[model samples]
Target: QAAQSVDQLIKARGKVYFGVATDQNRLTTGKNAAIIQANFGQVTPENSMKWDATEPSQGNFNFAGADYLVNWAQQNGKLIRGHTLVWHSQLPSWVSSITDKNTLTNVMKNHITTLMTRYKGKIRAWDVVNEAFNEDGSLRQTVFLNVIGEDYIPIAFQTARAADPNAKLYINDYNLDSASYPKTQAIVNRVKKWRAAGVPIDGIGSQTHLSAGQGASVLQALPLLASAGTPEVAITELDVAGASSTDYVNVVNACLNVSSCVGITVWGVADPDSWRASTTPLLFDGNFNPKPAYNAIVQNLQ
Candidate 1:
């Protein structure tokens, strides 16, 4: 008998979802859309939900791209994860150039409120704050940190909770796939502190963008993230450059080993669709054909 799709295979084993990160452009492409619908059960808008794409100007919201993805996810019965409510990059100058703390706080609050309110019960989770820590475990010196201080993280989560109490809020960052990395520890410490203070954080997102040999490290990191007091942990944006079928099996097994690891979202639909396109990352080739990595995951789950 034919095995189930990747998402269905994972769900049958008790995982929450198997997702893909996609954007408006890819969703409109027939091949990309077909592959995503056939394989994944969850979707995260790759760029449309980011600050620059959603609100390039202050208090001026644009949802054309974001709405398209949301509507598609709903129609397809796929879970939606809001990519981000706050991040340092892809932020408009109007936000990054803010000098006053109060101004920036209000801006952050408004952005989160607007997005969460708009997508209220539809989104399953959100990356409330992303890439906030340096690799060495220090907070990155973004406008939010410099102006609003570290309070910005909690405040963003709080605002998101207020806007939509049901959606799970996550703090996402890259290079966090290993517990040994200071960045991972920093996030763990902050999440613990915030939860102790009654801040509304629900999950930690490991953006496990890695090279081929690093898949084993993800197996080590997810348990630590789950121990950080959050209700869930997820592999939010995963792609391995020069990866083989064994690497994909390792990643899938890593999530399976950790009870609280809720889901995995591959960073893009195919190699050419990825931000690191030249590296040929992801489970599909440029032709949208399933690669060994995809088959490995299916076989592993079966």
Candidate 2:
């Protein structure tokens, strides 16, 4: 007999979600969309929900793509996980050029409030701030930092909190797993400090992008991240390059070990659709068939 679905197994144990990354381009399709609705309980837009996608030029906002993604998720009975509110990447020139501290502060708050307010009740959670740290355990020198300093992080979170009081807001970043434990600890420590300073950050997001031999060390991050005292944690943007079934087992088992880990979302639905296409990363192959990783997870759960 066929085993239970990933969502079925994960939820039977706790409130954890089994999710996948998607975009507006793929949601209106055939087999790709079919597989998503069949297996995943939650969705995150690959790029449409980010800063540039919603606001291309200054004073102009475009929620058309984002709204479409959200509507698709809602219509399909999948929960929405908003990709990001603030990040140094994919930013428009108007935002990147802002130098005045006062002006940047206002812009940061306005951006967060506008986006969050628009989708207040629809989104279940959000990546409120994305990748604000350097690899060396220091704050990344971003336009917000160059202009507004560290206040931008708290300001973004607080603004989002005010806009949508119900949603779980989190700080998200990449490579915060076994690839580098120090990087993981650095982000965890920073989040703890933010909480200590009264920031409303609710969780930590480990981007967990893994490779073949790299899978073993990746699971070590969950416990370390939980110790930061955040209320929740999630494996966001998970993809393993040149990986096998045991890799999935290793990663999933780690999340199962940590009670506060609330969700695990793959970076893309299939290898062909993945941003890291060269690596063939994901649980599904190009034909939308379950790969070894998928079977491995099912067997592990059983």
lDDT of each: 0.89, 0.84
Taking the tens digit of each residue's C-alpha lDDT, what string does model 2 give over 208-230? 88877666675676888888998
What is the Å distance of residue 285 in model 2 from its true position? 0.8
List runs of model 2 lying over 4 Å from the truth: 1-4
- Choose the strongest candidate by lDDT: 1
Tens digit per residue, CA lDDT, model 1, 162-227? 899989999999988888988888889988988999999999998889997889888888888888
Instruction: For model 2, state the Cα shift of residue 43 in Å.
Output: 0.3
Best by TM-score: 1
TM-score (C-alpha, index-matched) for candidate 2: 0.96
- How far off is residue 182 in model 1, in Å? 1.3
Provide the lowest-lDDT 10-residue window in model 2. Answer: 1-10
Over 4 Å off, model 1: 1-4
What does the lDDT read for residue 18 in candidate 1? 96
